[PDB]
Amino acid sequence: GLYKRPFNEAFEETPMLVAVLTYVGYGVLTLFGYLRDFLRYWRIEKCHHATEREEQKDFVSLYQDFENFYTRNLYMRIRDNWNRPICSVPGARVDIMERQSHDYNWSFKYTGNIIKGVINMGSYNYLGFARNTGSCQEAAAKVLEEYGAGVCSTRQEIGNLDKHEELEELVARFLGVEAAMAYGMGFATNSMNIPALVGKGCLILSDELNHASLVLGARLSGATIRIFKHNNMQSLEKLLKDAIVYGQPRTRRPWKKILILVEGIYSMEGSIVRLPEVIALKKKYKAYLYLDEAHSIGALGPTGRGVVEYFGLDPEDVDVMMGTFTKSFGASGGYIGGKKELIDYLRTHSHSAVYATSLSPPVVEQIITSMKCIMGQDGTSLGKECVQQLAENTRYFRRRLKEMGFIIYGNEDSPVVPLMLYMPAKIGAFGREMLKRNIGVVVVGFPATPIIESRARFCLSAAHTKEILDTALKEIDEVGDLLQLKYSRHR
Amino acid sequence: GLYKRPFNEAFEETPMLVAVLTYVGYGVLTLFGYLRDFLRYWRIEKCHHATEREEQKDFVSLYQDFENFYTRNLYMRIRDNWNRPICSVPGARVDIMERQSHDYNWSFKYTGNIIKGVINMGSYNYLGFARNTGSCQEAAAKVLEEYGAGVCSTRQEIGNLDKHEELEELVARFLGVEAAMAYGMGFATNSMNIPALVGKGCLILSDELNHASLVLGARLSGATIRIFKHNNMQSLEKLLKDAIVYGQPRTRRPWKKILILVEGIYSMEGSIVRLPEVIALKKKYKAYLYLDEAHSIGALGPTGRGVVEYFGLDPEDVDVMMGTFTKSFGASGGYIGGKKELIDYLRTHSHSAVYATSLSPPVVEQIITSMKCIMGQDGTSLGKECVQQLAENTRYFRRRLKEMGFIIYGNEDSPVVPLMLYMPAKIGAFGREMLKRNIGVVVVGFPATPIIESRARFCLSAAHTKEILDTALKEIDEVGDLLQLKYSRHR
Amino acid sequence: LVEMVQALYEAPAYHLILEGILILWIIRLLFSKTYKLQERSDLTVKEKEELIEEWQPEPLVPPVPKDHPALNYNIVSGPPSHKTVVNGKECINFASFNFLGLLDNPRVKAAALASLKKYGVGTCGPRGFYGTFDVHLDLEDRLAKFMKTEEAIIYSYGFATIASAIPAYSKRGDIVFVDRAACFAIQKGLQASRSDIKLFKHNDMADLERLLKEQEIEDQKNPRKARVTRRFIVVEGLYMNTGTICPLPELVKLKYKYKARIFLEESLSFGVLGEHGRGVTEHYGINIDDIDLISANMENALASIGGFCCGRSFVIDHQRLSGQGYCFSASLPPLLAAAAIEALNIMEENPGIFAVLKEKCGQIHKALQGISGLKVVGESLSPAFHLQLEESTGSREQDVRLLQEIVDQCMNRSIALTQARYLEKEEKCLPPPSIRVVVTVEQTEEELERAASTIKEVAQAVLL
Amino acid sequence: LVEMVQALYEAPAYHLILEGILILWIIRLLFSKTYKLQERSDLTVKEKEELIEEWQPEPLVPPVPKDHPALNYNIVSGPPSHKTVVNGKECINFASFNFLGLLDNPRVKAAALASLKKYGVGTCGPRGFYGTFDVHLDLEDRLAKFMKTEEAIIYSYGFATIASAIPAYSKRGDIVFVDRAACFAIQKGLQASRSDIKLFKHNDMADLERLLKEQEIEDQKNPRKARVTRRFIVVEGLYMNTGTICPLPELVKLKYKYKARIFLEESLSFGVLGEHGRGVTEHYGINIDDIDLISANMENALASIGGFCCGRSFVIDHQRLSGQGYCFSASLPPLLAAAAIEALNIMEENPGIFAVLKEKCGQIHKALQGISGLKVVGESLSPAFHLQLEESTGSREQDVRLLQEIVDQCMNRSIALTQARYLEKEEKCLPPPSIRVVVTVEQTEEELERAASTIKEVAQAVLL
């Protein structure tokens, strides 16, 4: 495969001193955690956690205490960063209900006052459709008045409505594939439609950084799972060759199927998948492709049709196209697109259709209205404006952040920008300092990531203006000066 | 598979003292051979062997001297036992041209006098057809006068005659199979018709004691050869299971064919093959069977139809039935019998038919006459008389030899009786002493056999009377008393 | 012996070290029975290419017979409610799991519109960050207060609730005693957790006792392992596949006697059973604390998308960090949360709707007795029960065809029924095909006996 | 450095032994890159049974097209000789390899009958024991004396002679330079011996020189290996597949220059070439000692079954113990041995038959020139030559069909011809299809020009 335009990604390596220092910090935390646990065990220090009721003392202990080691010792110290309640629409500016704790984050008590105007860089807005006023809200209100809050049965029995059918045909037209099917949860889409496609005696080649839903769907099916390196086409060639040549592990038999699970944009890294190469190998080795366009269905592409439009390839090359409405379109749900026989088989033999409740009518109405707005069916130019504004914002933000001396991951086109903090204490420090300057960011630590790579993710949007980006960039530069977060040798 | 009558074989194990003593003898021989070679190398002792001509001294030496170690040191000492010329028909009594050597068996000079009346127990007569006078000789003389000594071309071009066609149809009627083909050499039959049946990508399961012709035929073909233990059905099951389950060695692919090479009677051991079991596994595992009835085609069976008649099974169960006319019928040649398609394919794609000269007319006439005599077509009772006389002789001989305290190998029905000598010097001692008493036997030593088992083989015949057997048995008992050859603890 | 030991002691050091090394070499040799053949072989490039060429993958989806009963989806031309329109024919809804008629209350729609005006439609993030609204905490508090329990946790999808709750507590190496007639969500939850699964007979305490006593014997076999294995009993308050209630007090006694915690599913039971509608626990009077975890979904009674789990903080708090459907997915939209809150308010205001629902269920269950080819499997207190073929035919397909003919002839006469749908190749214990009857607090008396008469006449017409 | 060495020397013994053991452990660990996964798996009994069931063997013999040219065997109604009867039609034999007409001499039949009266038909045993007759030693002595050589050894089957002689001397790791147009017996002999085979162009000394010089370069590359490899050159005196003679003197010079022994095949050459009929050596005058081994078969000239090898005792004596066809097979019947002895006596008595054979071969080879579609490949001294298609068609099958039509039209006119037969899938260098012409000392002049005219007319009739 070849690229019609350059494909440039930068993953700068960690400085050695920073690695030594983060190991020092983790060792200190581990030793103090062991001392903490000893003190709590010998009842010298009071334990604030709940306890099993006295009637079940002789029962086997519910949890293994070593499993929650990091929860009590490392997670609880900076627990105030994550579960931050909000009390307004998650636009470019969000209102956060401010909270305080006096028992060192074990229990939080809410103060009356409320923060206002916090710049939102943690919500998944990509086209700015999360608005409490507009045309989509009016249509959703109309359908809510007509239809109600939710359906009370499954698709197969009585829960199929006309709204679902028209949403499915609209999605099929939008993607470009023959047919599509819709579900009420993006997680459930994978977890219930991967077991149906593959079973015992098949092979699944998962990326190194796949989402939890894809992994759970792979495990629920009896297929064998092999993990190849992140965006390493050579590794994918090697696993495909070995799987085809050597067959099944115990008794040498041909694989019934070979399925490759990949995503458009990986949220944490921000790296766009090398789609032309993987499609080339898929065709060469006669494999099947499952593409998760959860993050790229609205963010990427000149018109917002996904990575298949960003690269310019043919949607018929991708066998299964999963997708999620939560990120870009501003409403919950999910979908799978493909050929008509695939959609019929999924309509008949999918867990979600048989046993699970359908989508809500206002939600499908909001999805329909937003999708019509993107494709220009309303007749206005609002569809193209947001798509070009998002690209302008992401290019400006990434360029200015990289020229300041920070370390940034991923491709230059991906709207998600991971800055690297590299140290356990700088996670909480960055979170608290950024909140003190009225900016909301998301910090990811050790057990999720590798040990040396701890990050903070900025999710950009088309709702952000130039003034908001300038304010955020100035605050980021000031904080990076304060915490010495500029680790880049190149600039 | 089941036996309609008991199948009893006895392979008594060697006494420990005899093993220690034969190892002592072989060690002494090896040390003296090394001293012999040192003396010959340093020119201290004159060498009687021929030497390369002076013009080729700088040429690379033709032979590797270590390969002929046993020839000069162990074989040459008792070389006078084997290549004994004869000057009469090999009947029950043969005339041997007696020879003497003064250079210790390196060179033999013939004395004028000729031994007469030596009892023949080394020739392969089984029905007594090796006679210089009779009906077969008259028919052979008639055809010799008519046709000549031999044909001057191959079967495919002009060398096919009516005599060959009628011999082939007679053989097909005799065996009971649909069709048969005839060749001018028993060795060539295997060596030229095993490469045609199997090729690269096939498996051959050879017995542990197969003839040299079968092994050479297997090697000339590119098939993989696996050797299973002698008459060990459990080993045959294990190799068949492993071959079917695990497939080809490098790349797991199914075997194109599985061919099992076995013989009726093994000449050296005297053990009859366990045909019902091997046919049972052949049918169960869908293999192919090649049966070499060189020794059993005339010796075994109530009417002399082979092991398939001795056991009583169906000839159609055996896929390929090789056979040789040399042993029982008294004339050189060979044949393969089977279904019509097999014979047609061999007629078209066998090396012997295409490139090799056909049989001689007097030989095929003698085979035809003897085969007609066996089946009673001449109308006399001579056919059954020899077959029953051979069984009487073999039972009497084996019983009387076993009651004397010797160690005998093989089944009680096999006409070949191997007595065990167990020591290197007793080989030559037994040969010379038996010749001094006017009995001709065949002695087999180390490099052919295992190290501890050296033997002397008696080949019985229907020409031998009760008086001849009594004389031979008395001489054998006297020699066994002289050399202490009775090693049997049971009797 | 002793002299040899003394002589060895008198010998030097390095020599004895060498002799010990030789002894270790001998003991290694004796047990080294691995008869390695010392051979290595590899495939050629052309052989690899031909192996690639010969392999042929199966199609991604098998061809469909195109005669599937589930191939044709019913198309509702409007909201699914009382006096619905399905397939273009006017009907009366006897298939939608709307027990309390809260779907079309103007109060619920008013609350939903009020929260829509403020927040919008999408949460745009997980609960772990910038996806938690005040409505979520308010709804969790309301659910905790309603059921008289410390804590509750809400999932944005009903199926994922129990399927994420079960794997959080049960891990590899544990023992689970689950009923045979358990819904598919419980089955997939028990498949996700790699614990050992033991099934007992439906509503039989004898099989549970036998399995528990065999587990007791296995515990006595190896106490150390028995001290680190946890035992769970997963049951449903009102079974969907059968429509029968569960014997809670005996389960509680078995729990306290054999040291095995209890997981309870109240999806049908939650809003219909009890004086105030709190589940099977209120129906039996069992104390709430005797049950570790109670799972439910707001889809049936509350008429809103999502589910929840209820229990003590010691048990609930683990799901916020171990529940995959909670950690790795977007939260519930504020619209549905407000609808659920208003439904809870309405349920708390008037507790007589449960009584009238019990009345109507009893009436219709008694009336539907006396059909030649149809047997009413279920109980006189469940809103949803079944109708099965008494004398079943030789095959399942003919049975489903007969039931679908009955369903079609009922729809043509303004009675909207449905047939229970299952995954034939996935269900552990596949139930027999059966028509499903659902009772609401909205269906009047005359509609009840009219539906009974229509089903009776159609059944006699078809099955004779 | 030096101080460290002194300190180590001053340290005790057992401690240094332990440190050395640790050093050996480290050096073992560093090179132990075998990343073993520590896993073991085995197949189940039912899986073995299903693997047994799925395997299907191919048929023992592939189906035949039933249109094979070799499917129909010619049937001779009597002895194959001059004025034979083939397929029921009277003919004149131009196909049997009977060059000297010794098949039907009354003297040969008298000798054969005399030895039949004494010994019978079968030897009944190998030469290794009780299978050696006085006639065998007499025949070996006669063959040794006839060819002016020390020793000769006789095999009971012509094909097996060279096929057993070649593997006895050439072993694995040697080099053999064999002509491309070598008969099948030589090819199978070279296959039985696992030595390295190098083929050069037919009757080209340039390719032999090039291969020898490349071998010389390889010798200079590694002298130690070059000192233990033996080099052989296998050639035929009169090639069967082509009918051309071999350049012996240049081969002898190449042998003495490059140290490679010579194996010679004289099957056609043995009884036709030379003043006294001793082969190509007598034709060229080359000394007999320059050639290590000379193989022949008594089937063509002597009209008797069997073969022989001739040479010095140093070379011949090895075959009695290493020749498989000699060691593991029954000896030649005394009948054929006596026939061969009488044929040798007749050949020694009158040496003009070779001259008249040369005369007739020259005449017929000159006469057969001038056929439009047939080219006469061969030489004017070989009794057997070929006729090939000048302008060959697109396929071999059409060519053999045309040649067989010519052969049939010739047989219908009392001329008995034959077509050369080969194994298509086995021959290393498959020759083109060709009719074969064989010349005898029995065919009169008029029969020669009549056969030439008949073949000419049939060729023009068919190929135009």
User: What HEC string does C309-354 produce?
Assistant: EEECHHHHCCHHHHCHHHHCCECCCHHHHHHHHHHHHHHHHCCHHH
Distance CA D271, CA B401 (A): 54
Cα–Cα distance measured from residue D302 to residue C10, given in angstroms and rounded to the nearest whole number? 89
Contact A251 D51 (CB under 8 A): yes
| Smallest CA–CA distance from C51 into chain B, residue | B251
Kindly give the interhelix angle for B361-374 and B135-146, rounded to the nearest 10 degrees: 150
* Alpha carbon distances (Å) from D460 to C193, D396, D449: 90, 20, 16
Would you report the helix, strand and coil content of chain A in percent, each value rounded to 5? 45, 15, 45
Cα–Cα distance, D218 to D220 (Å, whole number): 5
Q: How far apart are CA C416 and CA C454, in angstroms?
A: 11
For residue C99, which of C261, C303, C274 has the smallest C-alpha distance?
Answer: C303
Who contacts C372 (Cβ-Cβ below 8 Å, separation ≥6)?
C390, C459, C460, C463, C464
Residue with tokens 């003495």: D256
Contacts of A258 in chain C (CB under 8 A): 57
The two three-digit tokens of residue A284, written as one number: 């060469």
In 10 A of CB A2, how many CB atoms? 6
Tell me if D121 and B141 make a contact (CB, 8 A cut-off). Answer: no
Mapped onto helix, strand or coil, the DSSP state of residue B409 is coil
DSSP letter at A323 equals E
CA distances from D441 to A176, D269, D355 (A): 91, 15, 9
In this complex, is the C-beta atom of A252 within 8 Å of any C-beta atom belonging to chain D? Answer: no
Cα C89 off chain centre by:
34
DSSP 8-state assignment for residue A75: I
Gap between the Cα atoms of C186 and C163, Å rounded: 6
Q: How far is CA B1 from the centre of its chain?
A: 27
Handedness of CA D267, D268, D271, D275 (dihedral sign): negative
Question: Residue C268 corresponds to which tokens in the numbers above?
Answer: 């049908």
Q: Do B149 and D70 touch (CB under 8 A)?
A: no
Comparing alpha-carbon positions, the chain C residue that sits nearest to A331 is C122
Residue B251: its chain C contacts at CB < 8 A?
Answer: 43, 47, 51
Contact at CB, B251 and C47, closer than 8 angstroms: yes
- β-pairing verdict for B334-338 and B179-183: antiparallel
| Lookup result for tokens 């008395």 | B474
Q: With CB atoms and an 8 Å threshold, state whether A247 touches B252.
A: yes
Whether residues D41 and A250 touch (CB distance < 8 A) is answered with yes
Tell me the three state secondary structure of residue D51. helix
- Of A461, A465, A469, A455, the C-alpha closest to A401 is A469
Contacts of A284 (CB under 8 A, 6+ apart): none
Contact criterion met (CB < 8 Å) for D229 and B354: no
**A213 CB within 8 Å of a chain C CB:** yes
Mode of pairing for the β-strands spanning B258-263 and B203-206: parallel
At residue B151, the 3 state secondary structure works out as coil
Interface of A with C in 324-383 (CB under 8 A): 326-327, 329-332, 341-342, 344-345, 347-349, 351-352, 354-357, 360-363, 366
Q: State the nearest Cα–Cα gap between A209 and chain C, in angstroms.
A: 14
The dihedral built from the CA positions of residue A246, A248, A252 and A256, taken in this order, carries a sign that is negative
Residue A94: beta bridge partners?
Answer: A118
- Chain A nearest-CA residue for B247: A252
Tokens representing residue B50 in the block: 């021929």
Query: Chain B residues with CB inside 8 Å of D113's CB?
Result: 141, 144-145
Q: How far apart are CA C221 and CA C243, in angstroms?
A: 39
Beta-carbon contacts of C218 under 8 Å, excluding residues fewer than 6 positions away, are: C226
| Helix, strand, coil percent values for chain B (each to nearest 5) | 45, 15, 45
Q: Are A80 and A105 in contact (CB under 8 A)?
A: yes
CA distance C263 to C463: 42
> Cβ(C365)–Cβ(C385) under 8 Å?
yes
Which of B243, B223, B252 is CA-nearest to residue B285?
A: B243
The C-alpha atoms of residue A334 and residue A182 are separated, in whole angstroms, by 6
Q: Is C259 exposed, middle or buried (0-12, 13-18, 19+ CB in 10 A)?
A: middle
**A150 in Cβ contact with A305 (< 8 Å):** no
Q: Which residue has the tokens 């604030």?
A: A48
Measure in Å the smallest separation between the Cα of C55 and chain A Cα atoms. Answer: 7
Which one is catalytic: B295, B402, B426, B464? B295
The answer to whether the Cβ–Cβ distance between B250 and C51 falls below 8 Å is no
Residue whose tokens read 């101080």: D3
Cα separation of C146 and C142, whole Å? Answer: 6
C-alpha angle D60-D64-D69 in degrees, rounded to nearest 5: 135
Catalytic residue flag (residue B271): no
Q: CA dihedral in degrees (B127, B132, B138, B139; nearest 10)? A: 50
Is residue C128 less than 8 Å (CB to CB) from chain A? Answer: yes
The answer to whether residues A9 and A410 touch, using CB atoms and an 8 Å cutoff, is yes
Residue type (1 letter), C322: S
The shortest C-alpha distance from A212 to chain D (Å) reads: 27
For residues A284 and A254, the answer to whether their CB atoms sit within 8 Å is no
* Contact assignment for A250 to D51 by CB distance below 8 Å: no
Chain A from 324 to 383: CB within 8 A of any B CB: none
Chain D CB contacts of C13 below 8 Å: 12-14
Q: Which residues contact A82 (CB under 8 A, 6 or more apart)?
A: C128, C129
Burial of A249 (0-12, 13-18, 19+ CB in 10 A): exposed
Separation between Cα atoms, residue D231 and residue D263, nearest integer Å? 11
The count of CB pairs under 8 A between chains A and B is: 3
D51 interface with A at CB cutoff 8 Å: yes
Asked if the C-beta of D187 comes within 8 angstroms of chain B's C-beta atoms, the answer is no
User: From D51, which residue of chain A is nearest by alpha-carbon distance?
Assistant: A251
* Three-class secondary structure of residue A42 per DSSP: coil
CA atoms within 13 A on the CB side of C327: 15
Q: Which residue of chain A comes nearest to C333, CA vs CA?
A: A332
What does DSSP say about strands D175-179 and D89-90: parallel, antiparallel, or unpaired?
A: unpaired
Residues 70-89 of B with CB under 8 A from C: none
CB contact under 8 A, C47 and B249: no
Q: Chain D partners of B50 at a C-beta cutoff of 8 Å? A: 312-314, 317
Contacts of C219 (CB under 8 A, 6+ apart): C226
Q: Please give the Cα distance from B136 to B330 (Å, whole number).
A: 10
A144 to C335: CB separation less than 8 angstroms, yes or no: yes
Q: Which residues of A touch B252 (CB under 8 A)?
A: 247, 252
CA distance D287 to D289: 6
**Nearest residue, CB atoms, A356 vs list C96, C97, C159:** C159
> Is residue B134 less than 8 Å (CB to CB) from chain A?
no
Neighbours of chain A (3+ CB pairs under 8 A): B, C, D
Cα–Cα distances in angstroms (integers) from residue D307 to residues A134, C138, D101, D345, in the given order: 108, 110, 19, 17
CB of A249 within 8 Å of any CB in chain D? yes
Which parts of A42-161 fold into alpha helices (H)?
69-70, 135-146
Chains in touch with B (3+ beta-carbon pairs under 8 Å) read A, C, D
The helix/strand/coil state of A51 is: coil
Neighbours of A214 (CB within 10 A): 23
Q: Which residue of C has its CA nearest to B251?
A: C43
- In units of Å, what resolution does this entry have? 3.1
Instruction: Using CB atoms, pick whichever of B129, B211, B356 lies closest to residue D158.
Output: B356
User: C341 near C111, Cβ under 8 Å?
Assistant: yes
Question: Considering only alpha carbons, which residue of chain A is nearest residue C425?
Answer: A349
* Token representation of residue A292: 């998760």
Q: What is the C-alpha separation between D382 and D437, in angstroms, rounded?
A: 10
Tokens found for residue B467: 């008086």
Give D-chain residues touching C18 at CB under 8 angstroms.
17
Catalytic center residues of A? 267, 295, 327
CB contacts, 8 Å: A219 with chain C: 192
Give which of A314, A323, A290, A352 is closest to A167, Cα–Cα: A323
Q: Which two tokens stand for residue D172?
A: 């694995």
Q: How far apart are CA C182 and CA C189, in angstroms?
A: 11
User: Which residues 147-186 of chain A have a CB within 8 Å of chain C?
Assistant: 147-162, 165, 184-186
Q: Which residues of B touch C41 (CB under 8 A)?
A: 249-250
CB–CB contact D122 B330 (8 Å): yes
Measured between alpha carbons, how far is residue A274 from residues A262, A263, A327, B427, D28 in Å? 10, 10, 22, 82, 43
Q: How many whole angstroms separate alpha carbon B72 and alpha carbon B63?
A: 14
* Structure-block tokens of residue D179: 């002509």
Angle among Cα C323, C328, C334 to the nearest 5 degrees reads 95
Q: Does A248 touch chain B (CB under 8 A)?
A: no
Measured over all CA atoms, what is the biggest interatomic distance in chain C, rounded to whole angstroms? 112
Q: Chain D residue with minimal CA distance to C15?
A: D14
Sheet holding C384-389, edge to edge: C374-375, C384-389, C434-438, C418-419
Give the end-to-end CA distance of chain B in Å, rounded to a whole number: 33
Range D106-349 classified under CATH 3.40.50.300: no
List the Cα angle C387/C391/C392 in 5-degree steps.
Answer: 80
Interatomic CA distance for residues A284 and A56, integer angstroms: 60
Residues A459/A130, Cβ–Cβ less than 8 Å: no
The tokens for B426 are 């007793």
Token pair belonging to B348: 């078209």
Q: Smallest CA–CA separation between A361 and chain C, in Å?
A: 9
Q: Nearest by CB to D74, which of B140, B148, B158? A: B158
Q: How far apart are CA C406 and CA C463, in angstroms?
A: 9
Task: Give C-chain residues touching B200 at CB under 8 angstroms.
Answer: none
Nearest to C120 by CA among A135, A165, A371, A442: A135
